[PDB]
Amino acid sequence: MVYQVKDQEDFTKQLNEAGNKLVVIDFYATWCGPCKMIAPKLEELSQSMSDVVFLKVDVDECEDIAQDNQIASMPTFLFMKNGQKLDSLSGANYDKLLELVEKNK
């Protein structure tokens, strides 16, 4: 299951518990159709790939997280590791997501 971050404290908590693992954060909105389409594929990915932490952020429930990360496209996937931002992906391209997961893990 992809873990839904609840607030900033929760977000910091998940980043620390990830250790040295790649963390992929799906910034999404409930009005976003592509986000709904890739959502089941992202679920199976998190079930298949325990070597990566998959989080998601509802931009409308966690507005300040979205603004701190200057989100501008829906969806946006942020790639973080050991406290550093490594990469970003705009849009719901699942094959590019898989390629960026492999690149950054």
- So which residues are the catalytic ones? 32, 35
60 is in an annotated binding site: yes
Q: Which is nearer to Zn ion, 31 or 94 (CB)?
A: 31
Q: Which stretch binds Zn ion (CB under 5 A): 13-21, 34-42, 56-64, 97-105?
A: 56-64
**Distance of alpha carbon 70 from alpha carbon 96, whole angstroms:** 21
60 touching Zn ion, by CB under 5 A: yes
84 class by beta-carbon count within 10 Å (0-12 exposed, 13-18 middle, 19+ buried): exposed
Binding site for Zn ion (CB under 5 A): 60
